[PDB]
Design a protein around this ligand. Structure first.
Ligand SMILES: COc1ccc2c(c[n+](C)c3c4cc5c(cc4ccc23)OCO5)c1OC
Lengths: 10, 257
């Protein structure tokens, strides 16, 4: 759900 | 000492990779010391219409252009935070929390790099919006930017360069006092090291600037008041301004805050 979380694992 | 300079250089190199528009490139544009450009100047409604192609009532369209630039900045700052040694090994929820509560302080910091007392570079340096024009927007829109201009003029008088800013931004992101952090100690340990690198950077790069380090610590306090004040203004906007709606990334950041 978190957008920041997906950004951080790219 | 040598380890502190290698950390400082690593952070500068990542900063250059993460942020396409640096303070050095921006002051060139602002002072007109560049070859390409110039930026299109937006100083009234007529020049706003003309400059539109770079890149709903006016206050609104402007406010909603700022969201997308803030959204791009969040992404660049995220990329930058992942280069700070130790940061990607932190609990992933703590990374999210550090960026959530830290990204606006960093945005306001780096926005000073694009400002002088007369206005602000926008669209990756392709436009310049005057301070006067922005204050002439209807309440409460005329007030968003002014306290950022007031911050930036005093911040800019410190004369930091990109090398200084890289470490200063990293210190701010590694703040162990953000709400809901699960494991504070590893974050303060990293920040303790970034603080010592910052101190040595200021000593060597600004040898005649007495107490510069103490002055930047105080700017970190001032950033928190700026962000508090900005959140209040946003609150007032949710309470009126009918159609308005944050970008989903901003909604995440603002959720609670
Ligand atoms: C991250 O870089 C940024 C980030 C935010 C902004 C920005 C420039 N402007 C004009 C605004 C802005 C202008 C406004 C406003 C709200 C605003 C909110 C943010 C920005 O409401 C009244 O007019 C910018 O410059 C390159």
């Amino acid at each position: 759900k978190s957008l920041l979380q997906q950004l951080l694992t790219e | 000492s040598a380890d502190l300079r290698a950390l400082a250089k690593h952070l500068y190199d990542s900063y250059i990779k993460s942020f396409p528009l640096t303070k050095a490139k921006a002051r060139a544009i602002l002072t007109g010391k560049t070859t390409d450009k110039s930026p299109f100047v937006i100083y009234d409604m007529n020049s706003l219409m003309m400059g539109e192609d770079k890149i709903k009532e006016v206050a609104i369209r402007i406010f909603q252009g700022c969201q997308f630039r803030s959204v791009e900045a969040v992404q660049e700052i995220t990329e930058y935070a992942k280069s700070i040694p130790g940061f990607v090994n932190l609990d992933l929820n703590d990374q999210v929390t550090l960026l959530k509560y830290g990204v606006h302080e960093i945005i306001y910091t780096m926005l000073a790099s694009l400002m002088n007392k007369d206005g602000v570079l926008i669209s990756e340096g392709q436009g310049f919006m005057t301070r006067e024009f922005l204050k002439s927007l209807r309440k409460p829109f005329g007030d968003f930017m002014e306290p950022k201009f007031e911050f930036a003029v005093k911040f800019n008088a410190l004369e930091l360069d990109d090398s200084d800013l890289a470490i200063f931004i990293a210190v701010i992101i590694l703040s162990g006092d953000r709400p809901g952090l699960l494991n504070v100690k590893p974050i303060e340990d990293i920040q303790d090291n970034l603080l010592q690198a910052l101190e040595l950077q200021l000593k060597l790069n600004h040898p005649e600037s007495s107490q510069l380090f103490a002055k930047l610590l105080q700017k970190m306090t001032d950033l928190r008041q700026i962000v508090t004040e900005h959140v209040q203004l946003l609150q007032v906007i949710k309470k009126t301004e009918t159609d308005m709606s944050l970008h989903p990334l901003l909604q995440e950041i603002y959720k609670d805050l």
